[PDB]
Amino acid sequence: EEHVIIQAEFYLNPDQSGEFMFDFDGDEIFHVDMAKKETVWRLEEFGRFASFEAQGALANIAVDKANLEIMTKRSNYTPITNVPPEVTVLTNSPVELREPNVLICFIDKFTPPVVNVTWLRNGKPVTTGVSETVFLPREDHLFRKFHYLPFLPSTEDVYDCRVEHWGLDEPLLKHWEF
Amino acid sequence: PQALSIQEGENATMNCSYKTSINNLQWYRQNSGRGLVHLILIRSNEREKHSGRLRVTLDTSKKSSSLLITASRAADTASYFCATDTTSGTYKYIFGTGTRLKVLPNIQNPDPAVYQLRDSKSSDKSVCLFTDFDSQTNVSQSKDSDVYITDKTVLDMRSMDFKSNSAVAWSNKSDFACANAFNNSIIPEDTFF
Amino acid sequence: TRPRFLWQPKRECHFFNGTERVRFLDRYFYNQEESVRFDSDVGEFRAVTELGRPDAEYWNSQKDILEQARAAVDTYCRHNYGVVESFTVQRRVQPKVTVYPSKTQPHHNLLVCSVSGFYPGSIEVRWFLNGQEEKAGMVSTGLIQNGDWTFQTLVMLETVPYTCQVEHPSVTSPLTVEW
Amino acid sequence: MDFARVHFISALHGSGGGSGGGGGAVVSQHPSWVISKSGTSVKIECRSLDFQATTMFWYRQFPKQSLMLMATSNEGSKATYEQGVEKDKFLINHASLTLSTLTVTSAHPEDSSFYICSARDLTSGANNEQFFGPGTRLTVTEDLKNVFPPEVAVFEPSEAEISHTQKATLVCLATGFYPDHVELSWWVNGKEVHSGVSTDPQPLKEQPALNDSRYSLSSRLRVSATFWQNPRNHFRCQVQFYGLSENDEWTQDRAKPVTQIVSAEAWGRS
Ligand SMILES: *[C@@H]1O[C@H](CO)[C@@H](O)[C@H](O)[C@H]1NC(C)=O
Ligand SMILES: *[C@H]1O[C@H](CO)[C@@H](O)[C@H](O)[C@H]1NC(C)=O
The whole-angstrom separation of Cα D68 and Cα D83 is 10
Nearest CA to ligand 2 atom 4: A76
Q: Are B87 and C79 within 8 A, CB to CB?
A: yes
C1-89: what fold? 3.10.320
Structural domain count of chain B: 2
Note if the bond before D48 is cis, omega within 30 degrees: no
Q: List C-alpha distances in Å: D130 to B20, C71, D10, D97, D121.
A: 19, 18, 14, 14, 6
Range of the domain at B190: 106-193
The whole-angstrom separation of Cα B54 and Cα B67 is 7
How many angstroms is the resolution? 3.0
Nearest CA in chain B to D130: B93
SS3 state of residue C65: helix
Same domain, residue pair D126 and D147: no
Nearest CB among C11, C29, C98 relative to A7 is that of C11
Q: What angle do CA A145, A151, A156 make, to 5 degrees?
A: 120
C-alpha of D128 from chain center = 27
SS3 state of residue B91: coil
The whole-angstrom separation of Cα D126 and Cα D147 is 48
Q: List C-alpha distances in Å: D24 to A159, D13, D124, D130.
A: 56, 14, 11, 11
Q: Which ligand is nearest to the CA of A74?
A: 2
Domain with B136 in it: what CATH number?
Answer: 2.60.40.10
In which region does residue C150 sit, left (phi positive, over 0), alpha (psi from -120 to 50) or beta (all else)?
beta
What's the CA-to-centroid distance between A71 and ligand 2, angstroms? Answer: 15
Q: Which ligand is nearest to the CA of A78?
A: 2
Tally of residues, chain A = 178
Instruction: Report which ligand 1 atom has the smallest distance to the Cα of C17.
Output: 1
The whole-angstrom separation of Cα C37 and Cα C43 is 11
Same domain, residue pair D45 and D175: no
The whole-angstrom separation of Cα B180 and Cα B189 is 14
The whole-angstrom separation of Cα D228 and Cα C161 is 119
Same domain, residue pair B112 and B147: yes
For the purposes of burial, counting CB atoms within 10 Å of the CB of A162, is it exposed (0-12), middle (13-18) or buried (19 or more)? middle
For the purposes of burial, counting CB atoms within 10 Å of the CB of C142, is it exposed (0-12), middle (13-18) or buried (19 or more)? exposed
C-beta separation of A28 from A6 below 8 A: no
A155 lines ligand 2 (CB under 6 A): no
Range of the domain at D184: 143-270
A127 lines ligand 2 (CB under 6 A): no
A78 lines ligand 2 (CB under 6 A): no
Task: Give the number of other CB atoms < 10 A from CB of residue A84.
Answer: 16
Q: Check whether C79 is labelled as a binding-site residue.
A: yes
Using the 3D structure, point to which of D116, D142, D168 is the last residue of a domain.
Answer: D142
Beta bridge partners of B69: B12, B54
The whole-angstrom separation of Cα D247 and Cα B175 is 44
Q: List Cβ neighbours of A34 (8 Å cut-off, separation of 6 or more).
A: A17, A18, A19, A20, A58, A61
Identify the CA nearest to A166 among candidates C1, C10, B121: C1
Nearest CA to ligand 1 atom 8: C17
Note if the bond before C86 is cis, omega within 30 degrees: no
C-beta separation of A3 from A24 below 8 A: yes
Using the 3D structure, point to which of D142, D167, D198 is the last residue of a domain.
Answer: D142
What's the CA-to-centroid distance between C37 and ligand 2, angstroms? Answer: 27
Q: List Cβ neighbours of D132 (8 Å cut-off, separation of 6 or more).
A: B36, B38, D27, D116, D117, D118
CA dihedral C170, C175, C177, C178 (to 10 degrees): 170
Same domain, residue pair D16 and D80: yes
The whole-angstrom separation of Cα C151 and Cα C93 is 10
Same domain, residue pair D188 and D94: no
Same domain, residue pair B69 and B158: no
Identify the CA nearest to C54 among candidates C35, C30, C73: C35
CA-derived radius of gyration, chain C:
24
The whole-angstrom separation of Cα D139 and Cα D161 is 40
Note if the bond before B156 is cis, omega within 30 degrees: no
Same domain, residue pair D15 and D128: yes
Using the 3D structure, point to which of D142, D167, D193 is the last residue of a domain.
Answer: D142
Same domain, residue pair D158 and D68: no
Instruction: Report which ligand 1 atom has the smallest distance to the Cα of C20.
Output: 2
SS3 state of residue C62: coil
Beta bridge partners of C99: C113
C-beta separation of C143 from C150 below 8 A: no
The whole-angstrom separation of Cα A12 and Cα B77 is 55
C-beta separation of D80 from D74 below 8 A: yes
CATH number for the domain formed by residue range(s) C90-179: 2.60.40.10
Same domain, residue pair D261 and D175: yes
Q: Are C74 and B43 within 8 A, CB to CB?
A: yes
Same domain, residue pair D187 and D200: yes
Same domain, residue pair B92 and B187: no
Same domain, residue pair B128 and B170: yes
Same domain, residue pair D211 and D242: yes
Same domain, residue pair B18 and B40: yes
Q: Which ligand is nearest to the CA of A76?
A: 2
Q: Are C83 and D11 within 8 A, CB to CB?
A: no
A16 lines ligand 2 (CB under 6 A): no
Checking DSSP bridges between strand B3-7 and strand B99-103, what pairing results, if any? Answer: parallel
Please list the residue range(s) of chain C that carry CATH number 3.10.320.10.
1-89
Three-state secondary structure of chain D? CCCCECCCECCCCCCCCCCCCCCCCCEEEECCEEEEECCCCEEEEEEECCCCEEEEEEEEECCCCCCEEEEEEECCCCCCCCCCCCCCCEEEEECCCCEEEEEECCCCHHHCEEEEEEEEECCCECCCCEEECCCEEEEEECCHHHCECCEEEEEECCHHHHHHHCCCEEEEEEEEEECCCEEEEEEECCEECCCCEEECCCCEECCCCCCCCCEEEEEEEECCCCCCCCCCCEEEEEEEECCECCCCCCCCCCCCCECEEEEEEEECCC
C-beta separation of D179 from D149 below 8 A: no
Domain with D39 in it: what CATH number?
Answer: 2.60.40.10
Method: X-ray
In which region does residue A57 sit, left (phi positive, over 0), alpha (psi from -120 to 50) or beta (all else)?
alpha
Same domain, residue pair B67 and B141: no
C-alpha of C118 from chain center = 13
The whole-angstrom separation of Cα D1 and Cα D80 is 13
Same domain, residue pair B113 and B99: no
The whole-angstrom separation of Cα D179 and Cα D147 is 6
SS3 state of residue C76: helix
Q: List C-alpha distances in Å: D210 to B172, D206, D207, D214, D215.
A: 19, 9, 5, 9, 11
Identify the CA nearest to A114 among candidates A68, A36, A66, A168: A168
Tally of residues, chain C = 179
The whole-angstrom separation of Cα D90 and Cα D44 is 11
What's the CA-to-centroid distance between B88 and ligand 1, angstroms? Answer: 22
Q: Per residue in B96-135, is it b (16+ CB within 10 Å) or e — as a string?
A: bebbbbebbbebeebebbbbbbebeeeeebbbbbbbbbbb
CA dihedral B171, B172, B174, B175 (to 10 degrees): -10
First-to-last alpha carbon distance for chain D, in angstroms, is: 75
For the purposes of burial, counting CB atoms within 10 Å of the CB of B169, is it exposed (0-12), middle (13-18) or buried (19 or more)? buried
What's the CA-to-centroid distance between A76 and ligand 2, angstroms? Answer: 6
Q: What angle do CA D9, D94, A38 make, to 5 degrees?
A: 45
Q: Check whether C91 is labelled as a binding-site residue.
A: yes
The whole-angstrom separation of Cα B8 and Cα B107 is 10
Tally of residues, chain D = 270
Structural domain count of chain D: 2
The whole-angstrom separation of Cα A51 and Cα B20 is 20
DSSP B97: P
Instruction: List, in order of start, the domains of chain A with CATH numbers.
Output: 1-79 (3.10.320.10), 80-178 (2.60.40.10)
Checking DSSP bridges between strand B93-95 and strand A172-177, what pairing results, if any? Answer: unpaired
SS3 state of residue A5: strand
Q: What is the largest CA-CA distance in chain D?
A: 75
Q: List Cβ neighbours of A124 (8 Å cut-off, separation of 6 or more).
A: none
